[PDB]
Amino acid sequence: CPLMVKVLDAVRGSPAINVAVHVFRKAADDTWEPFASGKTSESGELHGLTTEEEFVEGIYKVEIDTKSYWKALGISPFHEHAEVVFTANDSGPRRYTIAALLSPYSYSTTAVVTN
Amino acid sequence: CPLMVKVLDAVRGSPAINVAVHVFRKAADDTWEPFASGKTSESGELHGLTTEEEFVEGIYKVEIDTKSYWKALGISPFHEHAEVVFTANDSGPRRYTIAALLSPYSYSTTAVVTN
Amino acid sequence: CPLMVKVLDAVRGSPAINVAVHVFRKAADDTWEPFASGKTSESGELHGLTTEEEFVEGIYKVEIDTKSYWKALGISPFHEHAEVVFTANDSGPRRYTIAALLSPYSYSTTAVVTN
Amino acid sequence: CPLMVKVLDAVRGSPAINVAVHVFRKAADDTWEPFASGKTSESGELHGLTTEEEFVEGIYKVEIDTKSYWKALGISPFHEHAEVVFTANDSGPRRYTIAALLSPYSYSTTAVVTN
Numbered sequence: 001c002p003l004m005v006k007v008l009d010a011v012r013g014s015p016a017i018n019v020a021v022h023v024f025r026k027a028a029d030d031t032w033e034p035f036a037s038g039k040t041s042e043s044g045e046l047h048g049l050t051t052e053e054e055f056v057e058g059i060y061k062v063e064i065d066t067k068s069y070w071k072a073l074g075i076s077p078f079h080e081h082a083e084v085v086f087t088a089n090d091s092g093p094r095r096y097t098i099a100a101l102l103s104p105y106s107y108s109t110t111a112v113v114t115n
Numbered sequence: 116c117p118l119m120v121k122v123l124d125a126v127r128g129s130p131a132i133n134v135a136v137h138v139f140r141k142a143a144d145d146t147w148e149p150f151a152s153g154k155t156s157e158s159g160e161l162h163g164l165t166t167e168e169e170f171v172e173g174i175y176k177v178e179i180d181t182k183s184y185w186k187a188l189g190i191s192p193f194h195e196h197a198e199v200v201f202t203a204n205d206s207g208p209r210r211y212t213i214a215a216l217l218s219p220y221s222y223s224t225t226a227v228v229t230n
Numbered sequence: 231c232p233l234m235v236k237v238l239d240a241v242r243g244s245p246a247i248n249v250a251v252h253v254f255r256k257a258a259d260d261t262w263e264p265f266a267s268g269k270t271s272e273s274g275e276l277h278g279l280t281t282e283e284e285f286v287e288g289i290y291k292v293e294i295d296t297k298s299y300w301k302a303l304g305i306s307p308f309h310e311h312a313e314v315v316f317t318a319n320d321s322g323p324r325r326y327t328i329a330a331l332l333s334p335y336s337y338s339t340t341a342v343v344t345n
Numbered sequence: 346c347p348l349m350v351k352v353l354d355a356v357r358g359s360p361a362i363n364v365a366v367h368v369f370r371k372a373a374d375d376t377w378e379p380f381a382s383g384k385t386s387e388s389g390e391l392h393g394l395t396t397e398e399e400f401v402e403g404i405y406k407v408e409i410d411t412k413s414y415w416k417a418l419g420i421s422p423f424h425e426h427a428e429v430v431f432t433a434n435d436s437g438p439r440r441y442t443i444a445a446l447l448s449p450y451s452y453s454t455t456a457v458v459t460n
Protein backbone atom coordinates (compact mmCIF):
# COMPACT_ATOMS: atom_id res chain seq x y z
CA CYS A 1 0.00 0.00 0.00
CA PRO A 2 1.16 3.56 -0.69
CA LEU A 3 -0.29 4.74 2.66
CA MET A 4 0.17 2.94 6.02
CA VAL A 5 -0.57 4.29 9.53
CA LYS A 6 1.21 2.93 12.61
CA VAL A 7 0.21 3.92 16.13
CA LEU A 8 2.15 3.22 19.34
CA ASP A 9 1.32 3.65 23.04
CA ALA A 10 4.07 5.40 24.99
CA VAL A 11 2.57 4.50 28.42
CA ARG A 12 2.45 0.74 27.93
CA GLY A 13 5.30 0.42 25.38
CA SER A 14 3.06 -1.40 22.95
CA PRO A 15 1.25 -1.09 19.68
CA ALA A 16 -1.98 0.89 20.03
CA ILE A 17 -4.50 -1.74 18.89
CA ASN A 18 -7.99 -1.13 17.43
CA VAL A 19 -7.51 2.62 16.98
CA ALA A 20 -9.99 4.11 14.44
CA VAL A 21 -8.37 6.07 11.60
CA HIS A 22 -10.25 8.18 9.02
CA VAL A 23 -8.60 9.57 5.88
CA PHE A 24 -9.99 12.51 3.86
CA ARG A 25 -8.87 14.16 0.66
CA LYS A 26 -9.37 17.84 -0.11
CA ALA A 27 -11.81 18.24 -3.03
CA ALA A 28 -11.66 20.90 -5.74
CA ASP A 29 -14.30 22.92 -3.76
CA ASP A 30 -11.99 22.90 -0.67
CA THR A 31 -14.14 20.50 1.37
CA TRP A 32 -12.78 17.29 2.98
CA GLU A 33 -14.11 14.25 1.13
CA PRO A 34 -14.03 10.86 2.88
CA PHE A 35 -11.20 8.83 1.29
CA ALA A 36 -10.69 5.67 3.42
CA SER A 37 -10.93 4.42 6.99
CA GLY A 38 -9.94 1.48 9.13
CA LYS A 39 -8.67 0.33 12.55
CA THR A 40 -5.17 -0.56 13.66
CA SER A 41 -4.38 -4.26 13.92
CA GLU A 42 -2.64 -6.14 16.76
CA SER A 43 0.67 -4.75 15.54
CA GLY A 44 -0.69 -1.19 15.75
CA GLU A 45 -0.55 -0.95 11.90
CA LEU A 46 -3.30 -0.15 9.40
CA HIS A 47 -2.64 -1.47 5.90
CA GLY A 48 -4.70 -1.52 2.73
CA LEU A 49 -6.26 1.92 2.96
CA THR A 50 -5.68 2.71 -0.73
CA THR A 51 -4.04 1.76 -3.98
CA GLU A 52 -1.34 3.43 -6.10
CA GLU A 53 -3.88 4.44 -8.76
CA GLU A 54 -6.47 5.80 -6.31
CA PHE A 55 -3.91 7.74 -4.24
CA VAL A 56 -3.43 10.57 -6.65
CA GLU A 57 -1.84 13.99 -5.92
CA GLY A 58 -3.74 15.99 -3.34
CA ILE A 59 -3.97 17.24 0.23
CA TYR A 60 -4.87 14.43 2.64
CA LYS A 61 -5.97 14.44 6.26
CA VAL A 62 -5.46 11.42 8.52
CA GLU A 63 -7.53 11.68 11.75
CA ILE A 64 -6.58 9.18 14.42
CA ASP A 65 -9.19 8.66 17.16
CA THR A 66 -6.83 8.81 20.08
CA LYS A 67 -9.54 9.95 22.55
CA SER A 68 -11.55 6.70 22.24
CA TYR A 69 -8.33 4.69 22.64
CA TRP A 70 -7.50 6.34 25.99
CA LYS A 71 -11.09 6.40 27.23
CA ALA A 72 -11.33 2.63 26.72
CA LEU A 73 -8.26 2.30 29.04
CA GLY A 74 -9.98 4.48 31.66
CA ILE A 75 -8.07 7.66 30.79
CA SER A 76 -9.47 11.10 30.00
CA PRO A 77 -6.81 12.38 27.63
CA PHE A 78 -6.06 15.93 26.53
CA HIS A 79 -6.57 15.69 22.75
CA GLU A 80 -9.76 14.95 20.89
CA HIS A 81 -7.78 13.25 18.15
CA ALA A 82 -4.41 13.39 16.38
CA GLU A 83 -4.75 14.88 12.85
CA VAL A 84 -2.02 14.78 10.24
CA VAL A 85 -2.49 16.94 7.10
CA PHE A 86 -0.10 16.74 4.15
CA THR A 87 0.31 17.18 0.40
CA ALA A 88 0.96 13.81 -1.22
CA ASN A 89 2.60 12.77 -4.47
CA ASP A 90 3.58 16.29 -5.51
CA SER A 91 6.86 15.06 -7.06
CA GLY A 92 5.36 11.81 -8.29
CA PRO A 93 4.13 8.70 -6.45
CA ARG A 94 5.64 7.95 -3.03
CA ARG A 95 4.92 5.50 -0.20
CA TYR A 96 3.94 7.12 3.12
CA THR A 97 4.09 5.66 6.61
CA ILE A 98 2.36 7.99 9.07
CA ALA A 99 3.44 7.01 12.61
CA ALA A 100 1.89 8.38 15.80
CA LEU A 101 3.25 7.90 19.35
CA LEU A 102 0.53 8.49 21.96
CA SER A 103 0.52 9.61 25.60
CA PRO A 104 -2.49 10.96 27.46
CA TYR A 105 -1.33 14.63 27.25
CA SER A 106 1.05 14.45 24.29
CA TYR A 107 1.48 12.91 20.89
CA SER A 108 4.08 12.95 18.19
CA THR A 109 3.68 12.17 14.58
CA THR A 110 6.31 11.38 11.98
CA ALA A 111 6.24 10.61 8.26
CA VAL A 112 8.60 8.21 6.51
CA VAL A 113 8.34 8.84 2.77
CA THR A 114 10.02 6.50 0.36
CA ASN A 115 10.41 6.35 -3.42
CA CYS B 116 -3.61 34.26 30.22
CA PRO B 117 -5.42 30.91 30.50
CA LEU B 118 -3.95 29.80 27.14
CA MET B 119 -0.34 30.13 25.98
CA VAL B 120 1.28 28.47 22.97
CA LYS B 121 5.01 27.74 22.77
CA VAL B 122 6.78 26.53 19.64
CA LEU B 123 10.37 25.12 19.41
CA ASP B 124 12.53 24.26 16.42
CA ALA B 125 14.32 20.91 16.67
CA VAL B 126 16.54 21.58 13.63
CA ARG B 127 18.07 24.85 14.86
CA GLY B 128 17.74 24.24 18.60
CA SER B 129 15.83 27.47 19.11
CA PRO B 130 12.47 29.01 19.71
CA ALA B 131 10.39 28.98 16.56
CA ILE B 132 9.87 32.76 16.01
CA ASN B 133 7.13 34.49 14.01
CA VAL B 134 5.06 31.35 13.65
CA ALA B 135 1.39 32.11 12.90
CA VAL B 136 -1.07 30.52 15.32
CA HIS B 137 -4.88 30.55 14.96
CA VAL B 138 -7.32 29.48 17.62
CA PHE B 139 -10.88 28.34 16.92
CA ARG B 140 -13.88 27.36 19.00
CA LYS B 141 -16.27 24.68 17.81
CA ALA B 142 -19.68 26.17 17.04
CA ALA B 143 -23.11 24.59 17.65
CA ASP B 144 -23.18 23.49 13.98
CA ASP B 145 -19.74 21.75 14.22
CA THR B 146 -17.96 24.44 12.22
CA TRP B 147 -14.75 26.05 13.49
CA GLU B 148 -15.26 29.61 14.58
CA PRO B 149 -12.07 31.72 14.57
CA PHE B 150 -11.47 33.16 18.07
CA ALA B 151 -7.93 34.46 18.43
CA SER B 152 -4.60 34.52 16.63
CA GLY B 153 -1.06 35.76 16.85
CA LYS B 154 2.59 35.17 15.93
CA THR B 155 5.10 33.61 18.34
CA SER B 156 7.58 36.00 19.93
CA GLU B 157 11.40 35.88 20.04
CA SER B 158 11.02 33.33 22.84
CA GLY B 159 8.71 31.11 20.69
CA GLU B 160 5.80 32.07 22.90
CA LEU B 161 2.38 33.49 22.19
CA HIS B 162 0.62 35.13 25.14
CA GLY B 163 -2.65 37.03 25.54
CA LEU B 164 -4.78 34.95 23.16
CA THR B 165 -7.75 35.08 25.47
CA THR B 166 -9.06 35.94 28.94
CA GLU B 167 -10.55 33.95 31.81
CA GLU B 168 -14.05 35.29 31.04
CA GLU B 169 -13.95 34.49 27.37
CA PHE B 170 -12.27 31.07 27.59
CA VAL B 171 -15.36 29.08 28.55
CA GLU B 172 -15.83 25.27 28.34
CA GLY B 173 -15.90 24.00 24.79
CA ILE B 174 -13.81 22.29 22.12
CA TYR B 175 -10.90 24.36 20.85
CA LYS B 176 -8.56 24.01 17.89
CA VAL B 177 -5.07 25.55 17.81
CA GLU B 178 -3.63 25.60 14.26
CA ILE B 179 0.09 26.26 13.98
CA ASP B 180 1.35 27.32 10.53
CA THR B 181 4.37 25.06 10.46
CA LYS B 182 4.56 24.97 6.67
CA SER B 183 5.14 28.79 6.41
CA TYR B 184 7.83 28.52 9.07
CA TRP B 185 9.80 25.83 7.22
CA LYS B 186 9.29 27.63 3.86
CA ALA B 187 10.78 30.80 5.43
CA LEU B 188 13.86 28.72 6.33
CA GLY B 189 14.25 27.13 2.93
CA ILE B 190 13.50 23.67 4.30
CA SER B 191 11.00 21.28 2.65
CA PRO B 192 8.29 20.32 5.11
CA PHE B 193 5.88 17.41 5.26
CA HIS B 194 2.79 18.84 7.06
CA GLU B 195 0.44 21.57 5.92
CA HIS B 196 0.16 22.67 9.58
CA ALA B 197 0.06 21.26 13.06
CA GLU B 198 -3.43 21.18 14.64
CA VAL B 199 -4.18 20.61 18.32
CA VAL B 200 -7.82 19.93 19.26
CA PHE B 201 -8.93 19.66 22.89
CA THR B 202 -11.83 20.12 25.24
CA ALA B 203 -11.23 22.95 27.63
CA ASN B 204 -12.05 23.41 31.27
CA ASP B 205 -14.04 20.16 31.65
CA SER B 206 -13.44 20.13 35.44
CA GLY B 207 -13.14 23.90 35.89
CA PRO B 208 -10.88 26.67 34.46
CA ARG B 209 -7.24 25.68 33.99
CA ARG B 210 -4.15 27.38 32.62
CA TYR B 211 -3.09 25.64 29.41
CA THR B 212 0.33 25.71 27.80
CA ILE B 213 0.26 24.05 24.36
CA ALA B 214 3.82 23.29 23.37
CA ALA B 215 4.87 22.11 19.97
CA LEU B 216 8.31 20.82 18.91
CA LEU B 217 8.84 21.06 15.19
CA SER B 218 10.90 19.13 12.70
CA PRO B 219 10.38 19.14 8.90
CA TYR B 220 8.87 15.65 8.85
CA SER B 221 7.70 15.29 12.44
CA TYR B 222 6.08 17.27 15.22
CA SER B 223 5.09 16.63 18.76
CA THR B 224 2.61 18.51 20.87
CA THR B 225 2.16 18.43 24.63
CA ALA B 226 -0.24 20.16 26.99
CA VAL B 227 0.87 21.40 30.41
CA VAL B 228 -2.30 22.02 32.39
CA THR B 229 -1.94 23.70 35.75
CA ASN B 230 -4.24 25.01 38.51
CA CYS C 231 22.40 30.56 34.51
CA PRO C 232 24.01 29.23 31.32
CA LEU C 233 22.37 25.82 31.87
CA MET C 234 18.75 25.14 32.81
CA VAL C 235 16.93 21.80 32.72
CA LYS C 236 13.16 21.51 32.29
CA VAL C 237 11.21 18.27 32.65
CA LEU C 238 7.54 17.65 31.62
CA ASP C 239 5.23 14.72 32.26
CA ALA C 240 3.27 13.56 29.21
CA VAL C 241 0.98 11.26 31.24
CA ARG C 242 -0.32 13.90 33.68
CA GLY C 243 0.12 16.96 31.45
CA SER C 244 2.21 18.73 34.06
CA PRO C 245 5.68 19.76 35.04
CA ALA C 246 7.64 16.81 36.35
CA ILE C 247 8.35 17.95 39.96
CA ASN C 248 11.12 16.77 42.30
CA VAL C 249 12.99 14.94 39.57
CA ALA C 250 16.67 14.40 40.46
CA VAL C 251 19.12 15.72 37.86
CA HIS C 252 22.91 15.19 37.92
CA VAL C 253 25.37 16.96 35.70
CA PHE C 254 28.84 15.63 34.85
CA ARG C 255 31.85 16.89 32.95
CA LYS C 256 34.04 14.50 31.00
CA ALA C 257 37.50 14.27 32.56
CA ALA C 258 40.85 13.93 30.74
CA ASP C 259 40.73 10.15 31.39
CA ASP C 260 37.21 9.80 29.85
CA THR C 261 35.51 9.30 33.20
CA TRP C 262 32.45 11.32 34.20
CA GLU C 263 33.20 13.85 36.88
CA PRO C 264 30.14 14.95 38.89
CA PHE C 265 29.74 18.76 38.65
CA ALA C 266 26.30 19.86 39.77
CA SER C 267 22.92 18.45 40.74
CA GLY C 268 19.46 19.41 41.88
CA LYS C 269 15.76 18.53 41.89
CA THR C 270 13.25 20.14 39.52
CA SER C 271 10.97 22.76 41.03
CA GLU C 272 7.15 23.02 41.01
CA SER C 273 7.49 24.38 37.47
CA GLY C 274 9.58 21.35 36.36
CA GLU C 275 12.62 23.58 36.13
CA LEU C 276 16.09 23.38 37.60
CA HIS C 277 18.05 26.64 37.69
CA GLY C 278 21.43 27.65 39.10
CA LEU C 279 23.35 24.48 38.22
CA THR C 280 26.40 26.44 37.20
CA THR C 281 27.89 29.85 36.39
CA GLU C 282 29.36 31.46 33.28
CA GLU C 283 32.89 31.16 34.70
CA GLU C 284 32.63 27.53 35.62
CA PHE C 285 30.76 26.31 32.52
CA VAL C 286 33.77 26.12 30.20
CA GLU C 287 34.00 24.22 26.86
CA GLY C 288 33.87 20.47 27.30
CA ILE C 289 31.61 17.44 27.03
CA TYR C 290 28.77 17.39 29.55
CA LYS C 291 26.31 14.72 30.63
CA VAL C 292 22.92 15.52 32.17
CA GLU C 293 21.35 12.45 33.85
CA ILE C 294 17.68 12.71 34.69
CA ASP C 295 16.35 10.16 37.22
CA THR C 296 13.21 9.26 35.33
CA LYS C 297 12.88 5.84 36.95
CA SER C 298 12.51 7.33 40.49
CA TYR C 299 9.90 9.75 39.17
CA TRP C 300 7.72 7.02 37.65
CA LYS C 301 8.21 4.77 40.74
CA ALA C 302 6.97 7.66 42.93
CA LEU C 303 3.80 7.73 40.78
CA GLY C 304 3.20 4.00 40.87
CA ILE C 305 3.80 3.66 37.14
CA SER C 306 6.10 0.98 35.65
CA PRO C 307 8.84 2.61 33.60
CA PHE C 308 11.08 1.31 30.84
CA HIS C 309 14.31 3.38 31.22
CA GLU C 310 16.77 3.43 34.08
CA HIS C 311 17.25 7.18 33.43
CA ALA C 312 17.38 9.67 30.62
CA GLU C 313 20.92 10.85 29.72
CA VAL C 314 21.76 13.85 27.55
CA VAL C 315 25.39 14.19 26.40
CA PHE C 316 26.61 17.25 24.50
CA THR C 317 29.61 19.39 23.78
CA ALA C 318 29.26 22.82 25.27
CA ASN C 319 30.23 26.24 24.04
CA ASP C 320 32.05 25.02 20.89
CA SER C 321 31.58 28.44 19.20
CA GLY C 322 31.52 30.52 22.38
CA PRO C 323 29.36 30.60 25.58
CA ARG C 324 25.66 29.95 25.03
CA ARG C 325 22.62 29.65 27.27
CA TYR C 326 21.36 26.06 27.18
CA THR C 327 17.89 24.85 28.07
CA ILE C 328 17.74 21.03 28.11
CA ALA C 329 14.11 20.01 28.00
CA ALA C 330 12.88 16.50 28.49
CA LEU C 331 9.34 15.18 27.93
CA LEU C 332 8.69 11.99 29.81
CA SER C 333 6.44 9.03 29.25
CA PRO C 334 6.82 5.59 30.94
CA TYR C 335 8.13 3.92 27.78
CA SER C 336 9.40 6.92 25.82
CA TYR C 337 11.23 10.19 26.30
CA SER C 338 12.30 13.02 24.12
CA THR C 339 14.96 15.59 24.78
CA THR C 340 15.54 18.90 23.03
CA ALA C 341 18.11 21.64 23.44
CA VAL C 342 17.19 25.31 23.07
CA VAL C 343 20.47 27.18 22.64
CA THR C 344 20.32 30.95 22.66
CA ASN C 345 22.79 33.87 22.53
CA CYS D 346 15.77 -11.42 17.38
CA PRO D 347 14.79 -10.39 20.92
CA LEU D 348 16.42 -6.96 20.43
CA MET D 349 15.98 -4.72 17.35
CA VAL D 350 16.92 -1.02 16.98
CA LYS D 351 15.18 1.23 14.46
CA VAL D 352 16.35 4.76 13.74
CA LEU D 353 14.49 7.44 11.75
CA ASP D 354 15.47 10.90 10.47
CA ALA D 355 12.90 13.57 11.27
CA VAL D 356 14.47 16.16 8.88
CA ARG D 357 14.36 14.06 5.73
CA GLY D 358 11.40 11.79 6.68
CA SER D 359 13.45 8.68 6.05
CA PRO D 360 15.16 5.79 7.72
CA ALA D 361 18.51 6.80 9.22
CA ILE D 362 20.83 4.47 7.28
CA ASN D 363 24.29 3.24 8.35
CA VAL D 364 24.02 4.51 11.92
CA ALA D 365 26.48 2.76 14.30
CA VAL D 366 24.87 1.17 17.37
CA HIS D 367 26.78 -0.32 20.34
CA VAL D 368 25.10 -2.42 23.03
CA PHE D 369 26.59 -3.00 26.52
CA ARG D 370 25.45 -5.08 29.46
CA LYS D 371 26.13 -4.17 33.08
CA ALA D 372 28.49 -6.75 34.64
CA ALA D 373 28.39 -7.99 38.23
CA ASP D 374 31.21 -5.47 39.06
CA ASP D 375 29.01 -2.59 37.76
CA THR D 376 31.09 -1.94 34.63
CA TRP D 377 29.61 -1.84 31.09
CA GLU D 378 30.70 -4.92 29.14
CA PRO D 379 30.49 -4.84 25.33
CA PHE D 380 27.50 -7.00 24.32
CA ALA D 381 26.89 -6.46 20.56
CA SER D 382 27.17 -3.83 17.85
CA GLY D 383 26.09 -3.15 14.31
CA LYS D 384 24.88 -0.54 11.80
CA THR D 385 21.38 0.26 10.64
CA SER D 386 20.39 -1.09 7.23
CA GLU D 387 18.65 0.73 4.35
CA SER D 388 15.38 0.43 6.25
CA GLY D 389 16.95 2.12 9.31
CA GLU D 390 16.69 -1.21 11.22
CA LEU D 391 19.39 -3.26 12.96
CA HIS D 392 18.53 -6.94 13.36
CA GLY D 393 20.47 -9.92 14.65
CA LEU D 394 22.23 -8.28 17.56
CA THR D 395 21.56 -11.20 19.93
CA THR D 396 19.76 -14.43 20.58
CA GLU D 397 17.09 -15.44 23.12
CA GLU D 398 19.59 -17.52 25.11
CA GLU D 399 22.33 -14.88 25.15
CA PHE D 400 19.97 -12.02 26.06
CA VAL D 401 19.56 -12.90 29.68
CA GLU D 402 18.19 -10.64 32.48
CA GLY D 403 20.30 -7.56 33.05
CA ILE D 404 20.72 -3.82 32.58
CA TYR D 405 21.55 -2.95 28.96
CA LYS D 406 22.78 0.22 27.32
CA VAL D 407 22.18 0.94 23.63
CA GLU D 408 24.36 3.83 22.35
CA ILE D 409 23.37 5.17 18.96
CA ASP D 410 26.04 7.25 17.20
CA THR D 411 23.80 10.07 16.11
CA LYS D 412 26.66 12.63 15.95
CA SER D 413 28.47 10.80 13.10
CA TYR D 414 25.15 10.45 11.24
CA TRP D 415 24.54 14.22 11.26
CA LYS D 416 28.16 15.16 10.63
CA ALA D 417 28.17 13.02 7.47
CA LEU D 418 25.18 15.13 6.25
CA GLY D 419 27.11 18.34 6.99
CA ILE D 420 25.35 19.07 10.29
CA SER D 421 26.91 19.80 13.67
CA PRO D 422 24.25 18.40 15.96
CA PHE D 423 23.66 19.03 19.65
CA HIS D 424 24.02 15.51 21.10
CA GLU D 425 27.10 13.33 21.14
CA HIS D 426 24.93 10.24 20.91
CA ALA D 427 21.51 8.91 21.94
CA GLU D 428 21.81 6.39 24.84
CA VAL D 429 18.99 4.16 26.00
CA VAL D 430 19.47 2.28 29.31
CA PHE D 431 16.97 -0.31 30.52
CA THR D 432 16.46 -3.45 32.60
CA ALA D 433 15.56 -6.35 30.32
CA ASN D 434 13.75 -9.63 30.89
CA ASP D 435 12.94 -8.95 34.54
CA SER D 436 9.54 -10.70 34.24
CA GLY D 437 10.81 -13.32 31.83
CA PRO D 438 11.92 -13.11 28.18
CA ARG D 439 10.49 -10.30 26.05
CA ARG D 440 11.17 -8.89 22.57
CA TYR D 441 12.35 -5.26 22.51
CA THR D 442 12.24 -2.76 19.66
CA ILE D 443 14.19 0.37 20.60
CA ALA D 444 13.18 3.16 18.18
CA ALA D 445 14.92 6.54 17.94
CA LEU D 446 13.66 9.58 15.98
CA LEU D 447 16.50 12.02 15.25
CA SER D 448 16.71 15.78 14.64
CA PRO D 449 19.85 17.86 14.91
CA TYR D 450 18.89 19.37 18.33
CA SER D 451 16.41 16.77 19.57
CA TYR D 452 15.77 13.07 19.72
CA SER D 453 13.08 10.82 21.04
CA THR D 454 13.31 7.22 21.94
CA THR D 455 10.55 4.70 22.48
CA ALA D 456 10.44 1.02 23.44
CA VAL D 457 7.89 -1.47 22.15
CA VAL D 458 8.05 -4.55 24.36
CA THR D 459 6.15 -7.66 23.40
CA ASN D 460 5.63 -11.08 24.95
Ligand SMILES: O=C(c1ccccc1)c1ccc2c3c(cccc13)C(=O)N(O)C2=O
Binds near residue numbers: 214216227327331
Ligand atom coordinates in the same frame (compact mmCIF):
# COMPACT_ATOMS: atom_id res chain seq x y z
O1 LIG E 1 7.14 19.91 24.60
C1 LIG E 1 8.28 20.10 25.01
C2 LIG E 1 9.27 19.16 24.78
C3 LIG E 1 9.19 18.41 23.62
C4 LIG E 1 10.17 17.46 23.37
C5 LIG E 1 11.21 17.28 24.28
C6 LIG E 1 11.28 18.03 25.44
C7 LIG E 1 10.29 18.97 25.69
C8 LIG E 1 8.67 21.31 25.61
C9 LIG E 1 9.91 21.90 25.39
C10 LIG E 1 10.25 23.11 26.01
C11 LIG E 1 9.32 23.74 26.84
C12 LIG E 1 8.08 23.15 27.04
C13 LIG E 1 7.16 23.76 27.87
C14 LIG E 1 5.92 23.16 28.07
C15 LIG E 1 5.59 21.95 27.46
C16 LIG E 1 6.52 21.33 26.64
C17 LIG E 1 7.75 21.94 26.44
C18 LIG E 1 7.48 24.97 28.49
O2 LIG E 1 6.66 25.53 29.22
N1 LIG E 1 8.69 25.53 28.28
O3 LIG E 1 9.07 26.74 28.87
C19 LIG E 1 9.61 24.96 27.48
O4 LIG E 1 10.68 25.53 27.33
Ligand SMILES: O=C(c1ccccc1)c1ccc2c3c(cccc13)C(=O)N(O)C2=O
Binds near residue numbers: 098109351353446455
Ligand atom coordinates in the same frame (compact mmCIF):
# COMPACT_ATOMS: atom_id res chain seq x y z
O1 LIG F 1 7.57 7.63 15.14
C1 LIG F 1 8.26 6.79 15.70
C2 LIG F 1 9.00 7.15 16.83
C3 LIG F 1 8.42 8.05 17.72
C4 LIG F 1 9.11 8.47 18.84
C5 LIG F 1 10.39 7.99 19.09
C6 LIG F 1 10.97 7.09 18.19
C7 LIG F 1 10.28 6.67 17.05
C8 LIG F 1 8.27 5.46 15.26
C9 LIG F 1 8.30 4.37 16.13
C10 LIG F 1 8.29 3.06 15.63
C11 LIG F 1 8.23 2.84 14.26
C12 LIG F 1 8.18 3.93 13.40
C13 LIG F 1 8.14 3.71 12.03
C14 LIG F 1 8.08 4.77 11.14
C15 LIG F 1 8.10 6.07 11.63
C16 LIG F 1 8.15 6.31 13.00
C17 LIG F 1 8.21 5.23 13.89
C18 LIG F 1 8.12 2.40 11.56
O2 LIG F 1 8.06 2.19 10.35
N1 LIG F 1 8.16 1.35 12.42
O3 LIG F 1 8.16 0.03 11.90
C19 LIG F 1 8.22 1.54 13.75
O4 LIG F 1 8.26 0.56 14.51
